[PDB]
Design a protein around this ligand. Structure first.
Ligand SMILES: COC(=O)[C@H](CCSC)/N=C/c1c(COP(=O)(O)O)cnc(C)c1O
Ligand SMILES: COC(=O)[C@H](CCSC)/N=C/c1c(COP(=O)(O)O)cnc(C)c1O
Lengths: 521, 518
C-alpha cells in the first residue's frame, strides 16, 4: 500500500565523453539529495545512526583537503596533510573507555596500540584475525614437537557476522568445523539436538530459544558448548582464537565475555596455553631456532556496534542513582580491564583485541572505526618502505584521515552523561517498540512474532510487504525453524533503535505496519 | 604543528569555543600543508567538489554489498557507483554493461580503502581462481594448485602485505623452498645464481636497478615465469602502471607478448582445474580456466594513461604529441594465439581516486571480468545484495566524489591535464639540471621518460617537511651500507602548476643541504 518513493534513474547519471553541463550536474545531485534525504529520514532497519547535522556544519570545511593518515598513527610520516594528532585523541578516548593502558608507548608491552579503519569493522575483524593468526603461529613480533602448536583453530557463534567467514577464507585460518571434519571426523564432542548425531556444527552453537533451537534464542554464544569445543582442540595441542560478539548483527545480542573468559581460562591453563614457548625462525649454525614466550589463545571482541554504547550502559549500572537510571539488563564486562586469577600464572588480562564501527552507534557519513590491541601483540610489519615515513602497521595503506575528524567532533560534543542518556533512551524505546508490537497483535488479531533479546537495541518481527521494507530500510533474515527443512521458513525483519530513532518515528512505522497488506493477511 | 593538548577529549566534553579553536588549528595546518604538497601522487585541489558535495555529509551513506543490486540499506549511491564504474570500464576498453550472463563483461566495485584494497582483492581473486576454488554461480602435476606470484622490485609495499595476508607464495619463496639451486638468473653483482627477492627492474647507468627507470625487466620476467610454468605452477603477474617512487610504467604489452607463448607451451591458456568432488562419489569435478592472471596496479596511472594514449592516437586532433609512449595495458589488449584465435590478456586493474582525480579520503576501483568472479565466502540474508567485495559496508560518498569530478571534464580536458603535467615534469627536470650548472652542485636529477615524477637529492629536513617531499634511500651496491643515497621526489599532479614549481626551485637553490653538497 505505502510508497517508498522513486529510486534514482541511471540515465541521469550516465557520464558522457564530453562531460555534463552545470545544469545537468546540479539536477543529478539534487535527485541524489532528494533520494538520500527521504531514505535517511525513514531508515530504522540497520544499526547505523542517521543524524549528524552538527558534524556536517562543523566539518564541511575539510572537504577541500586530500587528507591521508598514511602509516602508523603514532608517527606523522612524510604526507603532511594528515590528522594523526586527532586520530590519537580519538584512540586515547576509546582506550580509556575500554580500560586499556594509556598512553600508547612502544616500550610498554601492556599499553594500547590501535588505529582508525578505512573500511568498517570488516577491516578490524580482518586485522584482528591476521594479528592473531601470526601471533599464534609464531611469526616475528615488533618487540623483543607438538605437531598442532602452529595450527590455530577459530571459534565463534552462529550469530557471528559474515565478515568472519570472509576473513577466515582470506587469511587461511581454519575454523574448528573445518579442522574437525579434516582431522577429527568422528570425534565431535557435541550431540546435535535435531538429529542426535555427533556431527560437527558449522559454528559454535548459540543459546536455544523456546523451540529448543537457536533460531528463536537470544543470539548469545552457548558458553558450555564453546568450552567443550575449545577443550577438545586445546587438548590436541592447537592454539585458540575466539571471537565474541558484542552487539550481534541480527539480534543485537551480547556474548557473555566475562563468563566465557572465566570458563576458558582453566582450560587454557591445563593445556599450557597461558604461557608457552614458540619458535619464530632459525639460522645456519650448531644451534638454530629463535624462541619467545607467548600466550596460546587470542580473545577478540567484535564490538562493531556494542563497543560504542556498552561502556556507557555499564557506567550507569555501576552508579544508577548518579545517572538516574538502572539498566534493565546486565551487559557483560568485555574490555581490556577484564583480568582473572590463575592457579599458578598470576592475574591474566583476558581480551587481546576489540573492533568498533564509527558509522554504527556514533554515526558517520562513510564506514570507519577502530581496531585496538596491546603493544605486546604487534607483529613485525610485512615490509619496511622508506617512502611513507611511518611504519606499515595497518591493514590499509593510505588511510581515511577525515574519519578521525568525524569521531573527534562527535565525542567532543557529548559528555559521558550525555552518552549514558543516548543508550538509556534507545533501551527504553526498544522496550516500547516490543510493547507496542504485542499490543498490535491483540488489537488486530494478527501474528507479529516480536522478539527482543534483553539489553539489545533491536526488535525482530514478521516481515511486512516489500514496499514497507523498502520505505523504512528494514533488514531481513529468513530462518528455518527446523534446520534442513525448507518448509519451516519464517521471514523476519528488525528495527534498530539508534540514537536517531525517536518515539515519533517508531509510532509512524507502527501506524503503517497496522495497515500493511502482508501483516493483515 | 598541532598540539595534542588542544585535542584531548575529556569525560565532560569540550565547549563550543574549545571545539572551534581546535578545528581552526587543524584547518590552518592542513590548508598550509595542502597548498605546498608536491612530493606525493595525490591531487590536492578539489574546491569545486567541496562546494558541490558538502550537502551530503549529513547522510550515513552505505553501499553495502555488490554494486549491481541495491540491497536493504536504501541510503546508498549504487546508481552513481555504477555510472562511475561504467565510465572507467569504457576508458579501459572493458565490455559493458556488466551482465552476469556475459562472462566477458566487466565486474568491479569501488574501494573503501585505497588501491591497497584493490591489490588485496586482485590477489585474493587470483589465488582462488588459479587454485581451483568455486566460481560465482551464473544465472600428472603436483603444482597445479600452487600459484606463484611475480612482480618487479619497484612494486608497492601493498603486495608484500597482500602476499603475507593471503598466503600467496612469491617466486622467491618457492625458489628457495623447492628449487634452491635452480635459479635461472645470474646476479649481476655477485655472479651467483641466487634467487632475487623480486623480479629485477631494468638497469640504469650503474648497471644496477637503483638508477634505472623502475620498469620491470621483461627478459628476466620471461625467464622466471617459464621456469615455474614448466614445473606446472599457475602464475600471477602484477605490473606497475605508474610506480610509487619512479612513476614508471611497466611495458604491459611487451610483457603480454613475451609471456603468451610461454603460457601456450605449458598449457596455461586453457586448463582443467579440479574444484572439489561430487557429493556421492569422491570424483574430481572440473571446469576449464586460464592458468595465469595478469593484474595491472594502476593506482596512479590508470587515471591518466588512457588520456595520454588518446592523444598519441590522434596528436593533431588534440594538438599534442606525447613525447613518451605509454604501453597498451587495459582490457582491450588482445593478442593472436598460435591457432590464429585471440586472447584477452589482462584479468584485473586497480586505480586510486585520491591519486590522479583527487578525493578527500582514500578510494578507488577494482575491475575484472565476470568469468573470474569467485563464489562469495558465504550467503547471509541480511544485507540483501551478495558479499562480493573485500569491504563489508562500503563508502558511498566516494562514488559522488568521482562522479562529480568525471562529470566536470571532457576527454579533451582530461588530455590537457596529463599534457600539462608531462610538460611541467619535463620543465622541472630542465630546471634542476640548470641549477646544477648555476650552483656547481650535484642534485642527481632523474626522470623516467613519460613519468610525472622527478627524483633528486634530498634537501634539508625543513624544506622536505614544508613541501611534503617523499623520501627514499637506495644502496648503490646492494647490501653495502656505505653506498647509501637519500633521494626525494616531486609528483607533478594537476594541482601542481608552474608557479608552485618555481617557488620550490627558488627555495632549493638556497637550501643548506643542496648548497653544502659534497
Ligand atoms: C546487514 O548489516 C550489517 O552487516 C551491518 C553493516 C550495515 S549497518 C552499518 N553490520 C556489520 C557488522 C560488521 C561489519 O562491519 P562493516 O564492515 O562496517 O559493515 C562486523 N561485526 C558486526 C557485529 C556487524 O554487525
Ligand atoms: C609513498 O606513497 C604511497 O605509498 C602512495 C600512497 C600515498 S599518495 C596517495 N602510493 C600508493 C600506492 C598503492 C597503495 O594505494 P593506497 O592504498 O591508496 O595507499 C598501490 N600501488 C601503487 C603503485 C601506489 O603508488
Amino acid at each position: 500500500a505505502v510508497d517508498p518513493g522513486p529510486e534514482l534513474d541511471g540515465g541521469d547519471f550516465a557520464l558522457p565523453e564530453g562531460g555534463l553541463d552545470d545544469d545537468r550536474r546540479l539536477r543529478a545531485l539534487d535527485a541524489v539529495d532528494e533520494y538520500l534525504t527521504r531514505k535517511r529520514k525513514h531508515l530504522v532497519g540497520y544499526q547505523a545512526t542517521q543524524d549528524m547535522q552538527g558534524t556536517a556544519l562543523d566539518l564541511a570545511r575539510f572537504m577541500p583537503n586530500n587528507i591521508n593518515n598514511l602509516g602508523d598513527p603514532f608517527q606523522s610520516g612524510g604526507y603532511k596533510p594528515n590528522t594523526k594528532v586527532v586520530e590519537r585523541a580519538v584512540l586515547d578516548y576509546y582506550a580509556k573507555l575500554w580500560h586499556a593502558e594509556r598512553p600508547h608507548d612502544p616500550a610498554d608491552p601492556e599499553s594500547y596500540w590501535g588505529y582508525m579503519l578505512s573500511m568498517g569493522s570488516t577491516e578490524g575483524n580482518m586485522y584482528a584475525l591476521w594479528n592473531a593468526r601470526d601471533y599464534l603461529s609464531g611469526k616475528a613480533l615488533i618487540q623483543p614437537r607438538n605437531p598442532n602448536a602452529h595450527h590455530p583453530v577459530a571459534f565463534y557463534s552462529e550469530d557471528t557476522h559474515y565478515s568472519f567467514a570472509k576473513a577466515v577464507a582470506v587469511l587461511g585460518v581454519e575454523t574448528f568445523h573445518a579442522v574437525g571434519l579434516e582431522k577429527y571426523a568422528d570425534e565431535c564432542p557435541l550431540v546435535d539436538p535435531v538429529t542426535g548425531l555427533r556431527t560437527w556444527p558449522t559454528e559454535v552453537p548459540s543459546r536455544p530459544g523456546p523451540s529448543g533451537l537457536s533460531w528463536d534464542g537470544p543470539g548469545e554464544i552457548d558458553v558450555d558448548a564453546l568450552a567443550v569445543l575449545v577443550e577438545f582442540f586445546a587438548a590436541k595441542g592447537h592454539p585458540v582464537f575466539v571471537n565474541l560478539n558484542l552487539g550481534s548483527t541480527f539480534k543485537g545480542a551480547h556474548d557473555d565475555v566475562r563468563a566465557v573468559c572465566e570458563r576458558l581460562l582453566p582450560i587454557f591453563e591445563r593445556h599450557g596455553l597461558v604461557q608457552r614457548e614458540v619458535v619464530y625462525g632459525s639460522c645456519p649454525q650448531t644451534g638454530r631456532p629463535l624462541v619467545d614466550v607467548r600466550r596460546g589463545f587470542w580473545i577478540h571482541v567484535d564490538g562493531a556496534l556494542g563497543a560504542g554504547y556498552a561502556p556507557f550502559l555499564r557506567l550507569a549500572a555501576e552508579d544508577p542513582e548518579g545517572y538516574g537510571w538502572t539498566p534493565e539488563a546486565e551487559l557483560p564486562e568485555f574490555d581490556f580491564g577484564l583480568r582473572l586469577p590463575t592457579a599458578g600464572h598470576g592475574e591474566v588480562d583476558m581480551v587481546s583485541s576489540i573492533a568498533m564501527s564509527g558509522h554504527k552507534w556514533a554515526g558517520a557519513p562513510w564506514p570507519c572505526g577502530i581496531y585496538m590491541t596491546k603493544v605486546k601483540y604487534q607483529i613485525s610489519p610485512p615490509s619496511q618502505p622508506d617512502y611513507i615515513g611511518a611504519p606499515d602497521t595497518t591493514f590499509a595503506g593510505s588511510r581515511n584521515g577525515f574519519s578521525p575528524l568525524i569521531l573527534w567532533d562527535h565525542l567532543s560534543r557529548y559528555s559521558y552523561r550525555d552518552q549514558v542518556e543516548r543508550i538509556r533512551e534507545a533501551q527504553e524505546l526498544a522496550a516500547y517498540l516490543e510493547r507496542r508490537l504485542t499490543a498490535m497483535e491483540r488489537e488486530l488479531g494478527v501474528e507479529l512474532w516480536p522478539a527482543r533479546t534483553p539489553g539489545a537495541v533491536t526488535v525482530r518481527f514478521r516481515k511486512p510487504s516489500a514496499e514497507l521494507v523498502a520505505k523504512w530500510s528494514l533488514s531481513s533474515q529468513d530462518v528455518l525453524m527446523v534446520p534442513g527443512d525448507e518448509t519451516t521458513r519464517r521471514s523476519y525483519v528488525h528495527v534498530f533503535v539508534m540514537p536517531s530513532v525517536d518515539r515519533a518515528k517508531l509510532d509512524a512505522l507502527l501506524a503503517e505496519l497496522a495497515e500493511d497488506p502482508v501483516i493483515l493477511g
